[PDB]
Design a protein around this ligand. Sequence first.
Ligand SMILES: C[S@@+](CC[C@H](N)C(=O)[O-])C[C@H]1O[C@@H](n2cnc3c(N)ncnc32)[C@H](O)[C@@H]1O
Length: 292
Amino acid sequence: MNKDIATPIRTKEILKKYGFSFKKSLGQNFLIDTNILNRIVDHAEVTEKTGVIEIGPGIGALTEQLAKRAKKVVAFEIDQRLLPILKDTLSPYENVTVIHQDVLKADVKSVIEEQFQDCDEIMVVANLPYYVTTPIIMKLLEEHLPLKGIVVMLQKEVAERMAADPSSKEYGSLSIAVQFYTEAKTVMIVPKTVFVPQPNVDSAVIRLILRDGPAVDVENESFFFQLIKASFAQRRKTLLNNLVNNLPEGKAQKSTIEQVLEETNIDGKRRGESLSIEEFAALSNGLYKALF
Ligand SMILES: C[S@@+](CC[C@H](N)C(=O)[O-])C[C@H]1O[C@@H](n2cnc3c(N)ncnc32)[C@H](O)[C@@H]1O
């Protein structure tokens, strides 16, 4: 409780024992609020059922809280300087494995196979480094990993885009990408005062529950995502305009794109940002057949 890593004094004591200096280049902002940490663990429903992938353990503030509930925790940490610290701070916990490696170069599926054979369910729970929040989430989702869900702390503005409702000004290609694979919900907003050092931007905790199969039925995922990106490329322009200018087929096959919009009952004159994920799926299947 009060003796845990994540108290302001305890955190400082550790950092001082090792003379640790933060690297803003690695998004190092450590949690020093045990109620926040416990809250995150609650939102991830971590029990003895659960094997947990943690990204960016730091000096172990969240790791410790996860370790008390989970069957097993594996934590990827990029900073070699933290490794001896974690060995010390997490010495009371025998269910923790730290792997020294940038999560973006890891083969997470192999790690899951090797480490979590005895777990009923796998969660990702993490206070993410803000400089690569979106790459990390995209990697985890793109690779169809056998996860129940992902609960992470990240920039507020990023959570808001991930979880965006279609009426939200934050609705975008990122909303669609996340919501294709998951049900997304921003569950907490956290002040800057619960970290050391305090971050420059606001923070939030988002909860992503992996869907049993994709949200919509599309012929071709690759094509679907490129279409999404082309459609949102300029906020104020028509969907047609965006497609002509952003699909490489756009300026070669414009008439075919106009025919498909007509055939799928989607007014080109609407903005791309008006389209729901279902309309995007319909448009994508129609275009994929025509385009190819
Ligand atoms: C925001 S801090 C959070 C630390 C700790 N989880 C906490 O809440 O106190 C981010 C952590 O991610 C680590 N990190 C940064 N980039 C990384 C990457 N690509 N892969 C794995 N860890 C990374 C940092 O070294 C740092 O420990």
